[PDB]
Amino acid sequence: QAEAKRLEREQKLKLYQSATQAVFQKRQAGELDESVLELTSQILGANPDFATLWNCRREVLQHLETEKSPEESAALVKAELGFLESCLRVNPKSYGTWHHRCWLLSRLPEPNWARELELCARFLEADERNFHCWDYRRFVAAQAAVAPAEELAFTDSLITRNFSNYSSWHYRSCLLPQLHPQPRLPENVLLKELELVQNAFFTDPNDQSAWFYHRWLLGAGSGRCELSVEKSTVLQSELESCKELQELEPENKWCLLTIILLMRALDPLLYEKETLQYFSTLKAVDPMRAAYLDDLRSKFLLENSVLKMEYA
Partner 1 sequence: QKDVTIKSDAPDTLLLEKHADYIASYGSDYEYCMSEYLRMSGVYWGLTVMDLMGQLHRMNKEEILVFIKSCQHECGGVSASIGHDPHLLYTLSAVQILTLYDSIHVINVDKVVAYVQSLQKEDGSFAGDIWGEIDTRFSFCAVATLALLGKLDAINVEKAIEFVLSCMNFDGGFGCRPGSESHAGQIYCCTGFLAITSQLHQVNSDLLGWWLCERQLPSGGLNGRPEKLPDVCYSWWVLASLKIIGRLHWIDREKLRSFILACQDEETGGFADRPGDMVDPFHTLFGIAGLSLLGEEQIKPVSPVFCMPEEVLQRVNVQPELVS
Contact 120, 78 (CB under 8 A): no
Rg of the chain (C-alpha set) = 27
Contact 191, 230 (CB under 8 A): yes
Q: Does 244 bind partner 1 (CB under 8 A)?
A: no
- Binding to partner 1 (CB under 8 A) within 215-234 occurs at 216
Contacts of 189 (CB under 8 A, 6+ apart): 176, 179, 180
Annotate 134-190 with DSSP letters as a single string. HHHHHHHHHHTT--HHHHHHHHHHHHHH-S--HHHHHHHHHHHHHHS------HHHH
User: How far, in Å, CA of 120 to CA of 130, rounded?
Assistant: 10
- Binding to partner 1 (CB under 8 A) within 289-308 occurs at 289-292, 295-296, 299
Tell me how far, at minimum, the Cβ of 56 lies from partner 1, in Å. Answer: 9
Q: Does 162 bind partner 1 (CB under 8 A)?
A: no
> Which of these ranges, 66-74, 118-126, 238-246, 284-292, lies near partner 1 under the rule CB under 8 A?
284-292
Q: Does 42 bind partner 1 (CB under 8 A)?
A: no
Task: Name which position in 7, 33, 38, 51 contacts partner 1 (CB under 8 A).
Answer: 51
User: How far, in Å, CA of 274 to CA of 292, rounded?
Assistant: 19
Q: Does 143 bind partner 1 (CB under 8 A)?
A: no
Task: Name which position in 154, 213, 278, 279 contacts partner 1 (CB under 8 A).
Answer: 213
- Provide the binding-site residues for partner 1, judged by CB under 8 A: 9-10, 13, 16-17, 20, 24, 47, 49-52, 54-55, 58, 95, 99, 103, 129, 131, 134-135, 138, 164, 166-167, 170-171, 173-174, 206, 208-209, 212-213, 216, 287-292, 295-296, 299
